[PDB]
Amino acid sequence: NTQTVLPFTGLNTPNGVAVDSAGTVYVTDHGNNRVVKLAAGSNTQTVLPFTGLNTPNGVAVDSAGTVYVTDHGNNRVVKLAA
């Protein structure tokens, strides 16, 4: 069997992963209060422009590429269009 480590960088206690129809992978980087994504084949993550996250701990992405995050430290759910 083969498992592959994805080239995210500087993750801290990550918690939550989603993958869209394009194979882009989204991760709630819980310990760094941010959400990062990696397109299929890409070597470098991008940080999603959410605002004021605290201990985010879950992520989902819909068919339109809208990203939903459980912003746990703030007791709320936020979403960001593609």
Place this chain on the structure above:
Amino acid sequence: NTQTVLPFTGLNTPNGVAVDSAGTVYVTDHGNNRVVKLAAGSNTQTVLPFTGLNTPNGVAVDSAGTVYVTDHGNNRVVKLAA
């Protein structure tokens, strides 16, 4: 491109999120020990009739709208049909 906050009422320590093909958003809630959902365009959530949960954590939804939840404290996975 600015984030929006979803109108869940009384959310306390969300643990996970999923979104179906219709854009309905499902969230697991630690403090209230329950799972809630919000249709796209709605600002009144519904509480899903799971019972005997001890901290729902993960949530997923399939193409048939069946909702799956990891019941963390009871070491089990429960589902409800649409």
Place this chain on the structure above:
Amino acid sequence: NTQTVLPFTGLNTPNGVAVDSAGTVYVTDHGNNRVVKLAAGSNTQTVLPFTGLNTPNGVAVDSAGTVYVTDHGNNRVVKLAA
């Protein structure tokens, strides 16, 4: 409103769940440092051949059957092809 408890066995503090097209359900069995899946029909529980996981806490599955896990304890995200 009847909920169904799936025939997973031996879970410990499960905290992430995903479901694929074949109706296969994947769970991050966090307390056992593993990811399990349940095949529809036969209800054969199989442990996915990830290795070196530590307190995993998020799982996702793409349209190709590739499984993605946030390996929280190791600050990384790992994937496994079908």
